[PDB]
Design a protein around this ligand. Structure first.
Ligand SMILES: [Ca+2]
Ligand SMILES: [Ca+2]
Ligand SMILES: [Ca+2]
Ligand SMILES: [Ca+2]
Ligand SMILES: [Ca+2]
Ligand SMILES: [Ca+2]
Ligand SMILES: [Ca+2]
Ligand SMILES: [Ca+2]
Lengths: 354, 46, 144, 354, 144, 354, 354, 144, 144
């Protein structure tokens, strides 16, 4: 039970320096296998593909089958992954599906390729490329990207919609203006709509290979008319996402630090339990104050309102500092202070008279 | 390579301007926000 | 339905105490002082600004019957409690200790009565060396 | 009356999943018609243009004439579009003009092209491209772009003005330096000002096709002198608009939520009506307080000042939270509290003496 | 023109009450208490900081005659009221109910008198099952 | 005196619609002259250069000499441009120097070119290009750019310094690796350091004409090693300036509006005059309070401190709202309120006893 | 001792105009030597490499050996660089290592090249390029870059990881789709994985030389599929770093000015010394208040808590203004004011009765 | 120099009134009340936090002699007054009216005495129909 | 270890004064007034919100023993003092004057007693014309 939690914390959620050495050494071994599998595509080093590409791949798939069995066994220290359905929910998370696909595909390819031999080598090269995708444990790269893409989603649909719309319109206009123009080599330059559409995609993202350049000045006029406007709309996602990342980094340096949410979180639990304690009339929750059948009907209401206030204050204690925090605490402080000055006035009158 | 030298000069000139402003970022970096103005040092001498 | 909302109308009439149809902050403060709670004015204001939707500062009867109708068994209200337990979860595995939970419930936030914590513990699965799985303990109070 | 509002809410301002299925299925059908109309430009698939391009276009224009008639009839549940002039104002909004142009142009082309046949097919292809422009109901894409372009308009005129000015100057300088240079193929590279201007537009937006490269080193010196400065000025609109979109998304997460503007908005109406109630002397608005001809002259002044204050507070209740909100409420709170401490002092003196 | 601004000078002299030429917050508070309104000090300050342009805190006579001269029939002042009605517009079609408007006017914000709401309703087109088109009701109070 | 101010306000600092029509019509006439002067570079339209390029240029230089004389005369309604030295200071501001250079250069060219004729036409074309530079009256475009370049100057020297440094180093490395490689056409590709430096400037700003591509894999390795790092450093000025423009636009929507600085500005004048009134002992400034030779020595000190406080408050009343405004007014309010509660306590004790 | 500090302040940490003239003149001399060393690579100016490249290099290395000896001697006015180990710590900072490498490499090359002669000239050219790297004294350029790269490090690992991952995957896919396609010249276009990887690196950073363009439409489909997504991920570091620089410039204009941290910093010293004064029982620190063996045990606790509070307030006095500053001072002010109103109430009751 | 700073030492000793060597806010408030000015506590604090540089809250003698030594003839202090006049400049030409300046100086900000404004006007060039060039009027009070 | 934490338990019991197990702000204020310090309520609150980690506002015994256990010889706590001396370092060379340090310690911040400053100076290397190297003076109080 203790050793299961320790090898879970070693394989997933890494910490320390030894665990850095483990994960980075495994990545470095699989990338050296990638390089020695890739260098055989060059005509000089084609003799390296026969020996080390089989009897190292089988050792690497034994190592990545064993690590998957150990990790899937060791994921039982968590509460949510316990029993058969817990292991089945651990096995359907995406990077576990990626690792399972990699190990079963390497088993299939090493079973087929042992008895054609070129498609075996091609499958081995694609699996060596794919096997680096599960080095990112916890999905901390993809989740950080997905959050910023989701927050800025409307302004990122807007520019892509206007950019693709301009792309369709002007690829058709440049096809209309250049469908009979002849290159200096003699070939017809734009011969179809897919041809002008390849031109448009090469142009709007500012690659410009120069294999397809419009020849007549009507085509050059339309091409500049489209280029000047649409290059900004295909460059806007980099600007939107980059400024979103930088504003998020600036936001996370102002932050309600951790102890601030400790008495709030407990205050969410007790009140919630008190609501659950309200429906049993013979509980010990009716013994705080020290006869019934209408006091209980208002204690249930007061406890539900206290639960809602506690949930609101727990949600506020996790956000960074903001202007509504200042406005809220000044409203509370001025309200309490005005009530106390009213109290002092209410006592000073009728303590004297007038 | 008739007027080739011009191009070399044109890059180095621009780099000179950059480094020129860089040194002007150091020598005219006054850092006014102290309790020691030069006039205030002269008054503290008196 | 109707015999439920008649009882909610009776509970509203316990707070109203006149023919105004609204619950002010004073009409709630008098009830909470008759129970013996002594609320602050800002607490009485925070309990009403969570409930009303017109923004005027009092509670009407559809606003009162709205909060009493919806069940705590939700998606937001379950996940907030499931996250509130994770603050007090050493090692993050989804299990908390019995003595740690008894120390947290009786000291931090609202001091919960020790006789109430003795009731709180035995409802949850305590066997296994003092550890308790709090996700079943969230299923107990949200789904019911 | 109820069914008219329901089919208005179905055709315009969509919500639900059934209405998603409707709008996305109509878009998907018109894009499949676009693809099968576009693939006939390729020489292999040129036999597909004869059959399905007429007897599917006539069905699609019947469907988009019927939907336009139903939508224009059903726009009468709104208050502003009632009667003849209401329908005429619904028919002059821009996407309705786009849809009317599409349906009447398809009727014209299918009347002409039924009795030359290539220009008919060309008009059909252009209408199939144009018909995707009215899928964006409500104009939510174009209005979001137009707002951010309008707010940043001075800084977006500045960079475009300096960029085009540098473009004109250096296109003329590169034309002066390269007008007699001969390409390796033997042709004169820059033969006119339009030629050097096409060079400048290809260069400053970082496409660089490489069909026109200056040959002599004076031209290369001027070309680099211009390229290094002006590429930043043609890349600045993407940076300005992207940072504007990201700052707007950050701004909309701090927001005065909805109930805050409910007692303000009603307070704008009553006071305004009270101003309108002031000019009739026999109204019941003079019966709040409980003899005349000079009290009325000051009640009109007090009611106009209350109207101005209510309009200011309704305008403040719609903006997001800001620093002047904190400053305004602290000024009001400290003013009221200082007045009450002054009151307590004014009573404590002369309740005792000294 | 001149017989108008003489009457506005008389109305200014009702607020001034001395030879100062300025309306302070006390000289406005005494008038509003003689009418029986009991304003707060912050309300008296907000009513003056909307009017003056010199920023000193009192109201001169050209500042007083400026706000009394311009008509409410404008572009901003019409659109703000047209937007203020849209908060209370269920389904957004441009029609509000009679009973809903009577409930809103007598509860939210400034409690408008029921005798005044009875006058407010019958000026507008009420026929058609209780619905009322509020855009004509904005044209009634802004253009007139 | 009145007409001089009105024609000054018409020629410089424009407002209205008539003045828009004036300035935009003058710009449109000079740009039509630019287009008809530029189209003669094309071989087809070379016959247009003889007639209309002289007898329209002389009319346009008469019109821009007359407008300069009228504007320089009419700049005397301002206080700072009065007399001979005032006109000489009006004539040395930059756009007036530009306009004077344009009119005297057109006079010189039309005197020389009336009696070679190609260099006359070339000078006319360059003056037609230059004459659009003084359409921007007030310099509102260049000053807005100059402010944002000056504020972000250290971070804009940083990236340019690192980018040019990487450019020098890797242009030399690619020259070392590719100085003997032979193109497929047969020519030596990189033959000098200027050659590799043209390659580097074409590469780092992502133009990539493709006239000069390194051939050997050492050169391609160094080229990618340099490209991947240095393209971001040459793209950073667009990002820095664009985010600076967008943050400035966001900043100018929170702003202390105009009346806030009216009682502050007057309070800067009076106190300053009071300091100047302190040195004359027989002034009427010593008659506010109602015997000397040491009260005067402390009144001078109190007046100088009041001047410094008034200057500080005038500088604060022009900046936008910020967090230190909230902190400053809370410090002042809590200080005054604590003093008044101390006063109430000091009176309640010793009004009673104990 | 005084002259040592003055020549240290002259050579490092420059100020004034004379010191600008010194540093900029030394930079200008070494860049003129760079240009006259670089122009010999051109075939026309190859006769300049023999004379001035030796007998100016030896003078320049004498000048940069002398300046290094003077600076390393003069770095003893600082406290941390005193004695042998102080000079050894001054000699291991990075720009001093750069200057030492430059002077010893020029000595080695001028010793070898005086007796082959081309590699001597090549080493001289590389040292002339390297010698401009130590003009940036204090490292103010590299530290400003390093700070912004370190703060935004997670979001700058994210985009580079996803970009290189997409680069590997799609370079392999385009190699698979184009490995048998033949160019119009007749050559096999993509012959290895390094070939397709050079294609991928040229494409994703939007250079696009056009020497390698995929030929078959499967390759063009994969190329566009990859280009459209991955160009934004290779353009995001410019956006992230540029918006980070602009947010830092906006942040440094709100700032707790210098005098605010003067009584805090002294309050960090005294309390710290008081903690060190606690352990000696016969100090004079026990004589503030005016018998022992348990008062000392609580004075040590109170002094350690005062030290922690003073360290917290010194850390707060160096950060710019923020929202938690407003929240902290309102909490302190409302707490003190509520305590004083409680005091007034506690005295008013029992001064009267009831 | 020394006979100047001896007089500044005497003026400092008029504020000090003991052997402390510092000017507190109370020692300045007593002088301003002996002159009959009645300052607020926040005004007394703002007058000291502009002067001191140690940040402790009192004024030492080099801090006192520093502000008395530097002349108002500067670049910042001239341009701030030249900009402060431009708020009250209709049409922006650099000339303000005599009656407008007399109305501004006696109403806005610190109410300047009318006997002082009569002295203020005649020092400046008033001839030319009531217009006055304020840039010479800034040269008069900053350079002298 | 145990004979240390028994003494820390005794020192905690000097603050507790009952069987509560917590140190409130009143139980600390009474000790500081018995020593004769007169703390403000905000100072008593700032001294406790630096120590506790549960956020409830009092100090438990592991929280009390945690701050008494760790040594000031650290990396952050040394560098903050090394930076705090650099504010009072004219010319930035790493040496401060004796008379300047005596003037700073007895005036700014907490007024340190002159008898204590006489002890403070002679511990540090004062020879060399009044200059003192403060980095050894930071090594003296942090490493010991
Ligand atoms: Ca009621
Ligand atoms: Ca309500
Ligand atoms: Ca008055
Ligand atoms: Ca006024
Ligand atoms: Ca004193
Ligand atoms: Ca001081
Ligand atoms: Ca206790
Ligand atoms: Ca605690």
């Amino acid at each position: 039970t203790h050793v299961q939690g320790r090898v879970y914390n070693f394989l997933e959620r890494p910490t320390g320096w030894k665990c850095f050495v483990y994960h980075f050494a495994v990545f470095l071994i699989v990338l050296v296998c990638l390089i020695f599998s890739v260098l055989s595509t060059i005509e000089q080093y084609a003799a390296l593909a026969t020996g080390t590409l089989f009897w190292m791949e089988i050792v690497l798939v034994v190592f990545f089958g064993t690590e998957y069995v150990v990790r899937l066994w060791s994921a039982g220290c968590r509460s949510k992954y316990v029993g058969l359905w817990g292991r089945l929910r651990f096995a359907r998370k995406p990077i576990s599906i990626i690792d399972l696909i990699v190990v079963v595909a390497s088993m299939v390819v090493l079973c087929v390729g042992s008895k054609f031999a070129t498609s075996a080598i091609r499958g081995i090269r694609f699996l060596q490329i794919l096997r680096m995708l599960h080095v990112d444990r916890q999905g901390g790269t993809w989740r950080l990207l997905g959050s910023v893409v989701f927050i800025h989603r409307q302004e990122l649909i807007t520019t892509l919609y206007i950019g693709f719309l301009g792309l369709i319109f002007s690829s058709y206009f440049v096809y209309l203006a250049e469908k009979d123009a002849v290159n200096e080599s003699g070939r017809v330059e734009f011969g179809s709509y897919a041809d002008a559409l390849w031109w448009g995609v090469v142009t709007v993202t500012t690659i410009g290979y120069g294999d397809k350049v419009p020849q007549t000045w009507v085509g050059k006029t339309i091409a500049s008319c489209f280029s000047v406007f649409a290059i900004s709309f295909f460059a806007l996602p980099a600007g939107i996402l980059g400024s979103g990342f930088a504003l998020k980094v600036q936001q996370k340096q102002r932050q309600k630090h951790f102890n601030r949410q400790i008495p709030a979180a407990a205050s969410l639990i007790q009140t919630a339990w008190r609501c659950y304690a309200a429906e049993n009339p013979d509980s010990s929750t009716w013994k705080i104050y020290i006869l019934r059948e209408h006091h209980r009907a208002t204690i249930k209401v007061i406890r539900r309102m206290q639960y809602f206030v506690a949930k609101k204050k727990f949600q506020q204690a996790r956000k960074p500092y903001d202007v509504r925090d200042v406005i809220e605490q000044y409203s509370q402080g001025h309200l309490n202070l005005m009530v106390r000055i009213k109290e002092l006035q209410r006592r000073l009158d009728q303590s004297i008279g007038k | 390579d008739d007027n080739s030298y011009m191009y070399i000069l044109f890059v180095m000139f621009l780099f000179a301007v950059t480094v020129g402003s860089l040194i002007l970022g150091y020598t005219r970096s006054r850092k006014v926000d102290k309790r020691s103005d030069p006039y205030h040092v002269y008054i503290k001498n008196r | 339905t109707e015999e439920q909302i008649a009882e909610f109308k009776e509970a509203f009439s316990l707070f109203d105490k006149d023919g105004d149809g609204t619950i002010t902050t004073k009409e709630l403060g008098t009830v909470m002082r008759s129970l013996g709670q002594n609320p602050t004015e800002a607490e009485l204001q925070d309990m009403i600004n969570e409930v009303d939707a017109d923004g005027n500062g009092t509670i009407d009867f559809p606003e009162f019957l709205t909060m009493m109708a919806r069940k705590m068994k939700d998606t937001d209200s379950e996940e907030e409690i499931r996250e509130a337990f994770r603050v007090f979860d050493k090692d993050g595995n989804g299990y908390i200790s019995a003595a740690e939970l008894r120390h947290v419930m009786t000291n931090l936030g609202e001091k919960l009565t020790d006789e109430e914590v003795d009731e709180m513990i035995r409802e949850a699965d305590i066997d296994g060396d003092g550890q308790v799985n709090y996700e079943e303990f969230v299923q107990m109070m949200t789904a019911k």
